Amino acid sequence: LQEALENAGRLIDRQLQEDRMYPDLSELLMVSAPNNPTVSGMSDMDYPLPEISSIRRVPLPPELVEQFGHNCMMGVFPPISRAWLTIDSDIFMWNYEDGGDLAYFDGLSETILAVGLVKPKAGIFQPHVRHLLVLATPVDIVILGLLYSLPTDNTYLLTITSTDNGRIFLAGKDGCLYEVAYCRKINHSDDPILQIAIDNSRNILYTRSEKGVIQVYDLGQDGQGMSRVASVSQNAIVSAAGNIARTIDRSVFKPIVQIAVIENSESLDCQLLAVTHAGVRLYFSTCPFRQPLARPNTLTLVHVRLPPGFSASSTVEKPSKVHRALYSKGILLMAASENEDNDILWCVNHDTFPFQKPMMETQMTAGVDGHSWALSAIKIITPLNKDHIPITDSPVVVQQHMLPPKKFVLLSAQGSLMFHKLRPVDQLRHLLVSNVGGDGEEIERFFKLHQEDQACATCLILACSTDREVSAWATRAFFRYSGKHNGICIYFSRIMGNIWDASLVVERAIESSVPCQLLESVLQELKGLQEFLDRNEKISLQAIQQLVRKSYQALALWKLLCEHQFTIIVAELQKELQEQLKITTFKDLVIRDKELTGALIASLINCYIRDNAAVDGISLHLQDICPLLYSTDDAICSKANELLQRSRQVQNKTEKERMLRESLKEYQKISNQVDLSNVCAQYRQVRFYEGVVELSLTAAEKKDPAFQERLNSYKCITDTLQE
């Protein structure tokens, strides 16, 4: 049945490689090079269930509202989870999660011009501070740890933005972009700059002037360069977008209300997004395509994607005068101005269709109260997988079984709103709870919108949870809507992830690749899957179930090895098997290998008994949790080996007699199977030739009750007699 185990290995590798190659953002936009830009959002299939179901409104505390009634700058600090508000430098930071932890501050003069939160340089600062507050006033800028001040020569700063490595950049009505070095200010240069965006992965800084001019600045690989790469006028952007569109009025391309950074985890080819009013997304590339290490050279426009309302067949109203936007992991959240007081929130995402080569998105509109001032967001790699690991980041459905939903906070005058993006598993849970049971009409549409394999993987994520009502409903939905076989394969591949093709050892001395807590979480998920399978294509499915059980036992063995001294267990082994372990995978160890598991078990038991401890506990545990990798034969072999190793002491002569006799009795029933020529060596080493003769006689009498093999066994008796 090793072929059935081997066959399911290609089935797991198929679904693992299927979720290994996914289209990039540039590929999703159907662009091929920065010389032929493409336009989407109008082909009636660009924009064909609750995208978010979390509306938690925490009102602004009345102490702040009373002062608000009497500047009105606002903002949020997601790293510290304390939203702030400003009424003439009376800056109070309240905890937007529950409306608490008021932090009044009105020490210096009024009329602050900019507020920023900076993660400080880890080198030179007191350890008790975790963040920095940078307040900009017309006379000077004060930096306060959570110190001293720096004067600005009458420059009206408007925005402050921090890099990941602690560099603070300010901009304002002076037209120049400044940096605070900590102290001094340095100018990196009629048009006020309103926004500064930071690309932390590729170290690219963007700006967005009042007229609309976007300037790309290159920080370099080090992050300290700050050289202007490009400077594109707004008219150039409008003309380029018109030429790419050729059928769209240019009034939607101007003005530009937001610029966002497209992270290296989302695209290797597109590095900037420009959101203009009426919700128009202009995709800008600053570096050559598919070159992760190429620094920016010019700011070019490669794609023009339209909002949902632009399509001829679309009945959705277009967004109107959007003033805030964010783009995170393919999710666009933009705030349109319905009135002076109310607002509309647009959520556009393609997490439902992550593999379609042309971009396929879904949109949601949510009416809220309060003008928006701050809308913000709250893999295991091995050398044997470096060439197969997808570089950027996995989609949502790949890691939805273990990743929490992405959380966002929208702050207005009335109060903060907390929401999170529903994972497909969350949408299925909402459908199951909203429906009476685990079947009906909304579940069928969920399993039809996603593929049957992906939908069954999501259903297994919900059904292997170990509350009971949702688990039973998810199990019924899984069994009601070969699709189940592919869903099981995909879910098992997503549980294992990048560990199935990964080596169980990464050099450093020699330690386990997977951390203990991650391994335990994977083990619990696999235990849930195995319990699901036990409670409930037949030959292939049974082979895959056996593979799941075998891999669960292997993972339990790996976890218990990590609990013990993994370095000692791996080191105390023959060099050939260690080198084989270097370039073998979990797939090969579970399936192809049948020697390294026993070697690891033997090393673990030897380490346990070299501590002068009874083996009866660890042997019982191994037999309980690894029946396939550890049989009763291994148990009696371990007991006899323990007796032989602990009988190498000269405390008493009569003590040796009973111990060696019982060890020989254990060896009598195991002489046929393992180590006939191995244990006789130590038997003669402990001066028990009488035992060697008896053991070899037992081997001759039981192994060959043929003639040639019995004579071969008697040759051992002759060799011992002559020894």
Sheet holding 407-411, edge to edge: 56-59, 415-420, 407-411, 374-377
Q: Identify the three-state secondary structure at position 485.
A: helix
d(CA 565, CA 152): 59
Task: Reduce the secondary structure of 436-452 to three states and give it as a string.
Answer: CCCCCCHHHHHHHHCCH
Q: Do the beta carbons of residue 102 and residue 94 sit within 8 Å?
A: yes
User: What is the C-alpha radius of gyration for the chain, rounded to an integer number of angstroms?
Assistant: 33
Q: From which experimental method does this structure derive?
A: cryo-EM
Contact between 128 and 120 under an 8 Å Cβ cutoff? The reply is no
Amino acid identity of 459? C
Structure tokens at 722: 């002559």
Q: Comparing C-alpha atoms, which of 316, 434, 328, 323 is closest to residue 364?
A: 316
Resolution of the experimental structure, in angstroms = 3.0
Helices then strands, each counted (H, E), the chain? 21, 30
Paired tokens of 219: 């920080």
Secondary structure element (H or E) that encloses residue 506, with its range: strand 506-507
Separation between Cα atoms, residue 472 and residue 251, nearest integer Å? 54
**In whole angstroms, what is the distance from residue 221 CA to residue 203 CA?**
7
Burial (CB count within 10 angstroms: exposed 0-12, middle 13-18, buried 19+), residue 177: buried
Q: Is 686 helix (H, G, I), strand (E, B) or coil?
A: coil
Contact 629, 597 (CB under 8 A): yes
Neighbours of 569 (CB within 10 A): 23
- Say if residues 15 and 460 touch (Cβ distance below 8 Å): no
What secondary structure letter does DSSP report for 500? T
Q: Is the sign of the CA dihedral 449, 455, 458, 460 positive or negative?
A: positive
Q: The dihedral of CA 25, 27, 33, 39: what is its sign?
A: negative
Instruction: Answer whether 85's CB lies under 8 Å from 68's CB.
Output: yes
Pull the structure tokens for residue 177: 């972009």
Beta strands 322-328 and 331-336, pairing class: antiparallel
C-beta neighbour count of 250 within 10 angstroms: 12
Contact 217, 188 (CB under 8 A): yes
User: Residues 282, 301: contact at Cβ < 8 Å?
Assistant: yes
Contact 104, 90 (CB under 8 A): yes
List phi, psi (to 5°) of 629: -85, -10
H-only helix segments in 435-537: 442-449, 452-463, 468-480, 483-496, 516-535
Q: Which CATH architecture has domain 31-422?
A: 7 Propeller (2.130)
Element at 39 (helix H, strand E): strand 38-40
Task: Give the distance, in angstroms, between the CA of residue 331 and the centroid of all CA atoms in the same chain.
Answer: 17
What is 64-126 written as a DSSP string? HHHHHH----EE--TTTT-EEE-STT--EEEBTTTTB-------S-S---EEEEEPPPSSSS-
3-class secondary structure for 222-282? CCCCCEEEEEECHHHHHHHHHHHHCCCCHHHHCCEEEEEECCCCCCCCCCEEEEECCCEEE
Check: CB of residue 226 under 8 Å from CB of residue 179: yes
Calpha distance 104→473 (Å, rounded): 50
Is residue 343 within 8 Å of 57, Cβ to Cβ?
Answer: no
Omega before 59 within 30 of 0, i.e. cis? no
Instruction: State the Cα–Cα distance between residues 51 and 469, nearest whole angstrom.
Output: 23
One-letter amino acid for residue 107 of the chain: G
CA dist., res. 259 & res. 280, Å (int): 11
Q: How far apart are CA 195 and CA 209, in angstroms?
A: 7
Residue type, 561: L
Distance of alpha carbon 322 from alpha carbon 520, whole angstroms: 46
Q: What Cα–Cα distance (Å) separates residue 511 from each residue in 189, 296, 315, 565?
A: 51, 39, 58, 9
The tokens describing 305, both together, are 């994607």
**Cβ-based burial of 640 (10 A; exposed 0-12, middle 13-18, buried ≥19):** buried
User: Which amino acid appears at position 80 of this protein?
Assistant: I
Q: What is the DSSP letter of 592?
A: I
Are 381 and 389 spatial neighbours (Cβ–Cβ below 8 Å)?
A: yes
What tokens appear for 440 in the block?
Answer: 């009906």
The CA distance from 354 to 24, in Å, is 10
Torsion sign over Cα 10, 15, 18, 20: negative
